[PDB]
Chains A and B, each alone.
Chain A
Amino acid sequence: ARPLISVYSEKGESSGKNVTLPAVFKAPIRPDIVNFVHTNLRKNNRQPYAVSELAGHQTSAESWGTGRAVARIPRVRGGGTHRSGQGAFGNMCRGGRMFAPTKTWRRWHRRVNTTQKRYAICSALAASALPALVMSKGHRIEEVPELPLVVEDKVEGY
């Protein structure tokens, strides 16, 4: 049983024209499906990020062996500067390579079944027809009439 809602003129009052409620507004409301679709779809507009694959690797460092009373971490060859003798190539070393460097080919995007994607749209539209849910979103609709709000086509020409 779909009621008969009225359309409103640009002055804010009903113009006498009525539209029967489309059946999509009585579709099941499934916030779990909407959340699942929204979570996966929102990943598709991201841009890839990654560190430089050369980062921390242009040093040519050696491990110094074990006969000297230091750690076996690779250390920069050379001398006469601060960088000489310092640890490198490790995630625990200052200026080293981070553990498991991020790669651009991480699976950024997700694909969702067309039926499930469209299902969420019907559930979202149906939930938009209940004033209690709209107030629960904080949309401050207490003085608007006919919560599913339809206005005349003259608005399209503004």
Chain B
Amino acid sequence: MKFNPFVTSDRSKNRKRHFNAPSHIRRKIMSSPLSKELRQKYNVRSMPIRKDDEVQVVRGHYKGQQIGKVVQVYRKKYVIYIERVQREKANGTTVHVGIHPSKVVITRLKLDKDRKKILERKAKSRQVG
């Protein structure tokens, strides 16, 4: 049960902010869980998705064991693109299939200056508890 008087639980209100959200906010909902190996080593459960991360699909028709890299983070449609997540168009070309970030697992992170700082900040909050 939520006790904060200034946070609403209204269905329409919550939906409106989710569908009408600025991109920098949308990145926060653009979050995916790390695999067990990153989670144990980084002590972090979930991370926002990025343009180049090794990503594994765990739900849907394309669910499998193969590892792929994100190639586009389409924040407008709340989807991302991996290489081998494709289907065959009618004429003959090949198009990507949008997969929601919550339905994938990050197997390798785009280790970067801002990134490296992000994990240790989340991780150091764990030893607080």
Quick check: do A and B touch in the complex, using CB within 8 A? no
Please list the residues of chain B having a beta carbon within 8 angstroms of any beta carbon in chain A: none
Please list the residues of chain A having a beta carbon within 8 angstroms of any beta carbon in chain B: none
